[model samples]
Target: IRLPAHLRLQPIYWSRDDVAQWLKWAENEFSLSPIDSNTFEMNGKALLLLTKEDFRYRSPHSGDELYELLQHILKQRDLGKKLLEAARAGQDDEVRILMANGADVNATDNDGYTPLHLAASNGHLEIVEVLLKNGADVNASDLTGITPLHAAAATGHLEIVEVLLKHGADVNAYDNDGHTPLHLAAKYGHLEIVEVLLKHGADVNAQDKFGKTAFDISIDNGNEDLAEILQKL
Candidate 1:
């Protein structure tokens, strides 16, 4: 294998295991050694941000080679960053241009937050559509496991929420806190999103890490309207 095929072209989407696997492959390729894999515990998102100095600090002896190992991945990540920036800015047309120019729709920026996450959170309906059309991961999550659906629900973007769900978003997907998109929708009292999430098969019975359901959270937030709907089955 010239390069590791298991490594996706989208480095920003690499999990911690993928990063570790890359390091191992690189080290083994050139008999590079003494690079402790544990030093770089963060995921690819963090790896992409590492400067030459940062790499040197992590591995005193093998730092340069390790950084060299990431040379090509880093190059691609820069291109991905441009697409990510356009998505964040809600430039639907620009996003399409970037995708046409060979940008991966599944590319992530900081902390594994994909373009879909930004578009959904910012209520950019057309941008979300553009992303999904180009094979964007509807269920892509941030470092904290916050999906685009979570972002849309948290921000009360009802139309974006609808689109995300229509595109096969995980309505019952939970974050690091075990809070699903419904938990956020109800917590913030986005009644329309709550209705939409329920309609799309969000588990009303789902509970968070604290063992509180969205219904319980709604009752505590004093959102009687949410509690009223959540109480029905």
Candidate 2:
């Protein structure tokens, strides 16, 4: 009731005739109970405000066209590949609708990047957290075998790195080339992520497919400080 004037305008505009017409229309439209008379919880006074033509029945663009437009409106990309499109082009309401309609949060793209992967890759911490809460598999791997942790580490997303590792991501899990997130972090020289991974028990001594350890990658990249630390480990 204390809502703003503009917010109140729509509700105020509704009158008794509108509600009566809405009930009349709803009785013939969808299968759901349309009248407050049938549902004990719905108040008759509230029922006096609805408009059937406005709230019920299909829009002219409904069915396949509506579905297609909805696809365009919501996130079309469930995998990492279309993430940029979704992030840049997706509508929030539409995204919610898609999720409600059964979009898989953990589904991956061609690159093995899940929606979580794309969210991590794009540094969308809130989105990543939301997806995680929605049951996105933390240990999900991409085609290259890189998990969301690797992408977060490579991008130096410290918060995301912490979140992923804490969610039970295999700190030492390797991608196709056997490059652990630590290996990617070392090569990228993201000191904070490297530290975070190490703190989470990433094995600096673990080797990649090429037999290169974190120390070796650091040394080859002339990161002597990191190399020295690796040697001490």
Q: Which candidate is the best by TM-score?
A: 1
Error of 1 at 57 (Å): 27
Provide the overall lDDT of each model, using Cα atoms, as 2-decimal numbers.
0.82, 0.63
Worst 10 residues of 2 by lDDT: 1-10
My TM-score estimates for the predictions, one after another, are: 0.70, 0.61
> Cα lDDT for residue 86, model 1?
88
- lDDT of each residue in 17-106, candidate 1, tens digit only: 888888788777878775667878988888889998898998877788778768756665666788888888788888889888767778
Which parts of model 1 have CA positions greater than 4 angstroms off? Answer: 1-72
Deviation (Å) of 8 in candidate 2: 50
Q: Tens-digit lDDT track for model 2 on 103-219?
A: 656545546567777777777777777777778898988878888898888888889999988788899888788899989988887777887888888885568888998888888
